[PDB]
Amino acid sequence: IVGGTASVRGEWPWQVTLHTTSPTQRHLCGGSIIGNQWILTAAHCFYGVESPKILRVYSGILNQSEIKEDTSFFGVQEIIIHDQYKMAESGYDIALLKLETTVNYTDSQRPISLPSKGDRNVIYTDCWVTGWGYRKLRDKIQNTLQKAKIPLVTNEECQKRYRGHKITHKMICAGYREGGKDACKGDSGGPLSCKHNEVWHLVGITSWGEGCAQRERPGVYTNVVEYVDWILEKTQA
Ligand SMILES: C[C@@H]1CCC[C@H](n2cnc(-c3cc(Cl)ccc3-n3cc(Cl)nn3)cc2=O)c2cc(ccn2)-c2c(cnn2C(F)F)NC1=O
Ligand SMILES: *[C@@H]1O[C@H](CO)[C@@H](O)[C@H](O)[C@H]1NC(C)=O
Numbered sequence: 487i488v489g490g491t492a493s494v495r496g497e498w499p500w501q502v503t504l505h506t507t508s509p510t511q512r513h514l515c516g517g518s519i520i521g522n523q524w525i526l527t528a529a530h531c532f533y534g535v536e537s538p539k540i541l542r543v544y545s546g547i548l549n550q551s552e553i554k555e556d557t558s559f560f561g562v563q564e565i566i567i568h569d570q571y572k573m574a575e576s577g578y579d580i581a582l583l584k585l586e587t588t589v590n591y592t593d594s595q596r597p598i599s600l601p602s603k604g605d606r607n608v609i610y611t612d613c614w615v616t617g618w619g620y621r622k623l624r625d626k627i628q629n630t631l632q633k634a635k636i637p638l639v640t641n642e643e644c645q646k647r648y649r650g651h652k653i654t655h656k657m658i659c660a661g662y663r664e665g666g667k668d669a670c671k672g673d674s675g676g677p678l679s680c681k682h683n684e685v686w687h688l689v690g691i692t693s694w695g696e697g698c699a700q701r702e703r704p705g706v707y708t709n710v711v712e713y714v715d716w717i718l719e720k721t722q723a
Contacts, residue, residue: 487616488668490667491633495581501518503517504514505543507541516616518670519545519596522588522589524585525583528581529578532567532581538562543562548631550629560589562583576655577616578638579708580710596685598679605682605711612676615667615678616634617676639663644657649718656713660700666703673692674694675691678692678707680710690708693707697706
């Protein structure tokens, strides 16, 4: 997260850090708890993932340095990638992880609500992007989970910034026109979380952008409300 600030314990209890153990263990992507055995994340995270056996989902983590040999994690039974997905910039950048066990909810690990289908066109004004990603283009994964409040940008304005890519109704853009705050490397798959009428909703999945936090180059997020039926279908199978 460029231009973000430190989160506190229990602030973002739906945020997870998805690690791969192969060839060596490392943070791969963010994700969000959405159900009792379900993480919602980005399809592009799995480009080099040979099998679900190498994945570990860590919930209830503030600092990456908390992740040691005996730290509790959830295994992954199945990776479900949207069957129309090809590449982040062409959309459908959405995936589910079916966990090996159910998740017992606490103040440090609990699900975020999907957006209401009735709020399909709502212009949310209390939206936050979170993650352990870079603070600038050439940086490192951060220890403490960072947050940044970022405004939504209309798809019409967003499309003007990305003449080389189709910004579809299944994408949502967010960023400051004057730049300065955005997702960056290591944040993808995590949430764009918006608080509306005292309830947090998972409005976006961090997907792609051109550079990090540049002027007039908003971040592009999977528009979760446009996939509610797909999510319900896959999570009940
Ligand atoms: C396979 C996965 C995910 C691969 C894509 C991932 N990604 C790509 N675009 C964004 C992005 C999103 C928005 Cl909304 C706006 C601007 C973005 N933007 C533009 C540029 Cl330039 N940078 N960000 C975020 C992001 O996270 C990524 C992650 C790492 C390195 C490079 N890209 C990585 C890891 C592990 N460690 N690192 C470490 F190198 F950061 N994961 C992997 O490589
Ligand atoms: C959840 O809590 C119940 C009741 O304490 C316990 O029996 C069970 O093992 C826990 N399961 C997980 C996956 O944490």
